[model samples]
Target: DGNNPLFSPYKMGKFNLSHRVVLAPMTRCRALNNIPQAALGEYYEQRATAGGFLITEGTMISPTSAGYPHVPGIFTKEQVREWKKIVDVVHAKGAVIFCQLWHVGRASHEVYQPAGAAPISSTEKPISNRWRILMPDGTHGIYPKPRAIGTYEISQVVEDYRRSALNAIEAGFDGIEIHGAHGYLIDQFLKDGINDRTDEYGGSLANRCKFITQVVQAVVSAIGADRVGVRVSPAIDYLDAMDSNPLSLGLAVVERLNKIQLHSGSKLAYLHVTQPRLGSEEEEARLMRTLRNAYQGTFICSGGYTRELGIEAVAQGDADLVSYGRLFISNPDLVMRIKLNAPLNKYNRKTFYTQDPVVGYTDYPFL
Candidate 1:
């Protein structure tokens, strides 16, 4: 049996983690208009193992930010009211949970936006070159052209993020993870691959990261820093989003986040980084070292982490926490499996993003 570091408990900010294992925020596209139904609550509760931290799916900040159907949001009173039940259930099982705030930006389809309005981005460009937006019927289609956000519109988006953060608090979430990764609205502004603006919110690395920093600040103000976490995919080229210089971009963002003092003495609870896997342990070690040195917070490493790899990361102090994504879908008792060195159940990829339940949702048995 592998001596996994994932089985150990550690202190992360205000919470004492029972284990180093964390369930990464994953999208199920099951929440109807941001309302997490009882089914969704049961799904999360079933996955809440001892010492495992759970993060919710990427929830939209507002209506215009709704890129996919059934993806949850925190903008409405009903949405928050629905989420409170989920938080309570997860808490009942002694799991710490965080609600992730998301904004799809140009990745949205006209059908998901307001009155068929164009998707908003840092610069005016056709979104067709980037991602294929997911429809309500689980079909994929080319994204439409996104309109350049004016200066005033940018302010409105910031306010939307602030409101969303407040809603997360009202919904009884233990923490809020700002979804600044995966080529979303925040990533669009942070990365030069899509943002070609020369305004105050673009051009240099400082400006490119301005929107994200402001969003983080707003969230911190609404919910405090201790209860806030930020996710960043520095060099992840997902959805055609890439940074001209990821090392520089990552360093700058980490430095900025380190300065902002959250409610707790720590600046922020966690700084999650999504890294690409190329089957190179040396590359993984190097990247982890770079991030650990840059950010002085509880670091979470995601993307293709298995039990063995997660143990290695924490044992070497490269990662304070390791987040599992797909594995949790099929093996709700992932922590126990890792602890007992049990075989993991294979996930059905076809139904990974589906709206239907019982197929890939909560039918998986725990050994």
Candidate 2:
């Protein structure tokens, strides 16, 4: 166990982590009316380990940022106050926690927007009919055509993220991870398939990356760069976020992130990249390795990493940290299990997004 790479200590900016296994930001839909509840605190506390790192589920930054029901937010006073309680407990356990700022772009239905207004995005396009949006009533609805965020409105969206970062800091969060992945608002701008603007935010790769960079700049300015991290999935193709040249897109993103750090003179907490799903295992590994090498700050790799793969990733320096989603959901003592090579509890996919407080939220057993 002492020889395992996963248990090795790491210096993640200002946080001294005891291990490299991070709790990936996951949406459990336990928050009612976009506010954190008591069960949410217990759920995070159940998984918290001293000297470990945890990223909260995607918390909405503004009213129009939400596409799913019951996902928490950081914009309102009550929302920040409720999150403060959860952050305190995680800190008491000696784990560093970061709130993930999220904005679901066109992947949303009008029902999730304010006054049933069209969802806002990089384009007026709707996500293909291949996927349906989740409604508050536990029913699925078709994705609505989104209203293209006007050029002037883009700065407001950036300010929303900046304010949300400040809110997370006020809530006692160690930092904030911007959710730029999974076909969210930021990804909508990064991927060509979603962004069709002729303004300063489209056509060229640099222009395409402008929106995310602006968001990052604003957030970093509000909260120091050392406490900020960004997550991107150039190859995910989720919610119709398809890029023709994913590798180039990924490289471009890495370059821009590195430039941001250089300009600010403070390295970011980390740059997290999801495993590529559009290629072979060799190709996927190559893509991750390239990004890991190019990024100047700590790197986290997520999307389908088993314990063995995590260990290997840490050992080979492919990723400074490995984030687990499903496995962590079913195994609160995941770090200890990995240390002892113990068995893991299987996660219930059916109950993953259900609003139950304990049935699948905090009832997972320890070894």
Candidate 3:
């Protein structure tokens, strides 16, 4: 009983978490018309647990931030109202929820953008055809060239993020998580493979990190640093958001966050990082351990983590919390099942992005 580190209590800044099992942010594509609906509340509440942490799926920060169809947004009044209903339910169950703010950057096609304008990113380069975009009609399409975000227009993007953070809090969320990971808008600037800019926002490591650094600064200025968490996936190359040296990139990000907190006189709630795809567990652990040590806040490790792996990671101090995406989607009573060492419900991959209200959304059973 004493050996399971996953069930251990931990203090994430001011939030007292009962266990280390966290719900990772996932894009379910169920928020039809870019607004959260009733089914979303049931889905989140089903996964809620007292003192457990749940991060909602990637919620777009602006109309231009939509890369996939049916994803939720927080820029509208009705959106806030809908999210408030869901937030109230999670809070009713005594769980702490954070809304993940997302911007897909170049991961979009013109069809998904406002007025069919080209999606904006750190560069005009298009995501290679090796990856396909998920359209509103559930069909795949090739990614088009994205217009590089003008240097002068950067402040407006940052402001959009700041406003979204405030909206999240206004909706009664405990906190907001910056989705700086997975080849999104922030990752577009952080990773050199996607960012080929000649301006102050690209080139050297420090310059490549400037965009996200500024974002954290602005968001922290609006809401206390304790209410903010940032998610980064320096290791994973999903959507071609690659960097020449991921370790150096990850450490650079940590250093910037540490500096931001130092100046703010407060610490960020957590820094969630995606696990590297190095094949060998030993090699992956070596890289993640370095970033985990460098960051001076709560560290969350995600990507293909199982119950046993999550327990081991927390037990070995590799991460403070372990987030599960697919497993959590399939098992609503994940915390209980993990604590009791019971079997989990298998998730359906095909229906993951479908717009069904229950088939793959809230249809998962409890033990």
Candidate 4:
């Protein structure tokens, strides 16, 4: 038995975690040529303490999926080789790490996509109309008009996800997490505001979730379901992603993923559910319960989680894991901070999305 809820050992599917605390995936843009290096490896290793599981920054699955410079990837053989070093280092530190597979979708500029083509989306509406994009020069800029992704190109995108999952295994990661949150490609498909396609991949809630389901199936096939997870933001509309019926969409996606049998031995491992911070306590509780019911595997809840709320969530059986995003940034020893009831360091918002290393990346001090 553990004194602190965050320090309690927990089992997520096949693997046992040191604690229920998780370092949520947060993008810092520190890679070289979108490849993880020794420096990045060390950064993660440093944060491997505090009895928490770690999930890396959002990593692209392919070059076409790259929306910003310095974002890491696991697609190319070189990239896989680069990430293996990261996995090895984190493993040596006795911390489990999962690489988050990401695709920016229409959040990309033409310069970042393959063939310098316009970024693809489920609908023709320009993402630039709604959200700002990060530039290669480490500055925030408005996104350019995006081209609608055609129905024919959807299959190719799914293949890219499949290839990425295989690459994650090749890179020796403990598991792979599909980035279905934050108005990314998968989020675009799930949200009606972004996805207006008349094809089978859009229209109904099931149709909108079709791409994500296929990607999950593909990843589970490549790597066992016990080693696969999917992240989704059902309530948060950050990045201009909005859903007409979030509850319906969230339940549908979770149910579909929970039912898929990837291997003879296991089903999907975990579901990471995110919501906006604007919800009431009652709303949060209801949403968490619904997510747990819909997804039969382990459930992770994120979105401005505090120590008390996190412990309460776990104790109340609302979630099996509580992921900390900003807390992990300023306090690498987050579990320690929670245990001692110490004040957390304030994060510099200016450096939150920058490419600089020392300032906001590895400069966090542990208590």
Against the true structure, whose lDDT is highest?
Answer: 3
How accurate locally is residue 320 in candidate 2, as Cα lDDT from 0 to 100?
90
- Residue by residue across 2-103, what tens digits does model 1's lDDT show? 467777778888888988888899999878665788878988999896556898889988888878788888898999999999898898999999988888
> After superposition, which runs of candidate 1 have C-alpha atoms over 4 Å from their true positions?
128-130, 262-265, 278-281
Clashes of each: 2, 0, 0, 0
Task: Kindly give the stretch of ten consecutive residues in candidate 2 with the minimal lDDT sum.
Answer: 273-282
Model 3's alpha-carbon lDDT is 0.92
Q: Is candidate 3 or candidate 4 better by TM-score?
A: 3
Question: Per-residue lDDT for 196-240 in model 2, tens only?
Answer: 899999999999999999999899999999999999998899889
Q: Give the TM-score of each candidate.
A: 0.95, 0.98, 0.98, 0.94
**Per-residue alpha-carbon lDDT of model 4 for 50-140, expressed as tens digits?**
3457889999877778787788988788899999988888888788888899998878887687788777777777664556677777666
What residue pairs clash in candidate 2, if any at all? none
Residue 166's lDDT in candidate 4: 84
- Evaluate all candidate structures by whole-model CA lDDT and list the values in order: 0.84, 0.92, 0.92, 0.82
- Candidate 3's residue-wise lDDT over 1-367, tens digit each? 2378998899999999999999999999889999998999999999999999999999989999988889999999999999999999999999999999999988998888878999889998999999999988888999999888787788899999999999998999899999999999999999989889999998999999999999999999998999999999988899999999988999999999999999999999999999864357777788899999999989999999988899888888899999999999999999999899999998999989999999999988899
Model 4 residue runs over 4 Å out of place are 128-130, 262-265
Report model 4's TM-score to 2 decimal places. Answer: 0.94
Itemize residue pairs with steric clashes in candidate 4: none
